[PDB]
């Protein structure tokens, strides 16, 4: 049986979620063809943490998780097993023991509108830094001053999210980028995902 989990649904598909609400799809009971991905020249950033390039296709895992979101170009560095900043501490924290990879490519032609597209959003404020693989979608309003914030919008107490100014004319650091995170759950459990050249194949 073909049993190929669809890379397109994670990459070739159109609708992408904002970074504060990174979409996660669980991956099990198929075969992953990594060769289809590391041969395309369209990706501009493609990093890995824990995996081999040549034996990439010959591995078996318990489960896989595919996260997808959209962020601008100059926040690509900010995703890493250890890193800080706006997105890293308030929207998406990669764990220090990260097992997997990160793909990212330019989406200026798709996610930018004339005069700017603001549908993509990112959290700008939170009281404690985000934990690894923690997706916070609370609309609670962030207190900045010592005066007790309250109500439904406050002075010096700002809404916790912000849109991206995605114009085609902005700098390339601002031109939008579609980003995918690949986490590899490896447990002492039934290994359901393998590659074309593993010992099960």
């Amino acid at each position, epitope marked *: 049986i073909t049993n190929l989990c669809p890379f397109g649904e994670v990459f070739n598909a159109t609708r992408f979620a904002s970074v504060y609400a990174w979409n996660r799809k669980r991956i099990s009971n198929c075969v992953a063809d990594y060769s289809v991905l*590391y041969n395309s020249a369209s990706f501009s950033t493609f*990093k*890995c943490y*824990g*995996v*081999s390039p040549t034996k990439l296709n010959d591995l078996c895992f318990t489960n896989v998780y595919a996260d997808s979101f959209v962020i601008r170009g100059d926040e690509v560095r900010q995703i890493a097993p250890g890193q800080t900043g706006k997105i890293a501490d308030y929207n998406y924290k990669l764990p220090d*023991d990260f097992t997997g990879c990160v793909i990212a490519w330019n989406s200026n032609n798709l996610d930018s509108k004339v005069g700017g597209n603001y549908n993509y959003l990112y959290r700008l404020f939170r009281k404690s830094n985000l934990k690894p693989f923690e997706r916070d979608i609370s609309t609670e309003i962030y207190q900045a001053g010592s005066t007790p914030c309250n109500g439904v919008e406050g002075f010096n107490c700002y809404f916790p999210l912000q849109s991206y100014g995605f114009q085609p004319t902005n700098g390339v650091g601002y031109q939008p980028y579609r980003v995918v995170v690949l986490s*590899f759950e490896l447990l002492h459990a039934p290994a359901t995902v393998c590659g074309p050249g593993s010992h099960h194949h």
Partner: antibody
């Protein structure tokens, strides 16, 4: 497959600045984090540095930081070597190597280039 | 920074017989998150660029002979060989790549006991 080539092998006198290159090609070349290693005349492989195409370098090992010489023009698949006031001991052979991730083995290597600074 | 040091400095072994090298790490670095060992060995013929022999001390590489194998427990890592041969001879080295600095190895020369 993915291969690497080097150049710049030369005789120089000390205190002079030289640039070498590691030019690579492959199907997936973005994966391959490039690191540099020195084999001096005496036996010993040092792993002087590390960088990635795009993004940034990974931290240079503590001893070499100070004569650090890393990379540029990442679009053209070359990793330049930029340093000055070279020591008389810097004469050695130097290789480049690559792997997929931050903590991954060196898969493919280059021919190597030797340099002499004996004045 | 973690120190990698090889057990045998020189080594003279006649062909068709087992030989073993071992490396010491200051802090064992394996299965911090994932099952393999994630340290490797390299061999470099004199006058040659070095090559790799096994990924993660448990993954043979393409074009690697089937008599080469590696077993590494904790901080000790034993590289064993089934039959020494003429093309097998080279300088041997370790790699540690779980932490951000690498120190490699002292260097294990090889001879022929003949």
């Amino acid at each position: 497959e993915v291969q690497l080539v080097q150049s710049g092998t030369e005789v120089k006198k000390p205190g002079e600045s030289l640039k070498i290159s590691c030019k690579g090609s492959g199907y997936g070349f973005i994966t391959y984090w490039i690191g540099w290693v020195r084999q001096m005349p005496g036996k010993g492989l040092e792993w002087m540095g590390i960088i990635y195409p795009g993004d940034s370098e990974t931290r240079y090992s503590p001893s070499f930081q100070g004569q650090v010489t890393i990379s540029a023009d990442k679009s053209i698949n070359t990793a330049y070597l930029q340093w000055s006031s070279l020591k008389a001991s810097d004469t050695a052979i130097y290789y480049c190597a690559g792997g997929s991730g931050i903590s991954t083995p060196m898969d493919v290597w280059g021919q190597g280039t030797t340099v002499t600074v004996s004045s | 920074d973690i120190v990698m040091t090889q057990s045998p400095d020189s080594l003279a072994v006649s062909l068709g017989e087992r030989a073993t090298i071992n490396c010491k790490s200051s802090q064992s670095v394996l299965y911090s998150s994932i099952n393999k060992n994630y340290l490797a060995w390299y061999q470099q013929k004199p006058g040659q660029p070095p090559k790799l022999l096994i990924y993660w001390a448990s993954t043979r590489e393409s074009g690697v002979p089937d008599r080469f194998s590696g077993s590494g427990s904790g901080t000790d890592f034993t590289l064993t060989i089934s039959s020494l041969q003429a093309e097998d001879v080279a300088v041997y080295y370790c790699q540690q790549y779980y932490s951000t600095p690498y120190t490699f190895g002292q260097g294990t020369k090889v001879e022929i006991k003949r």
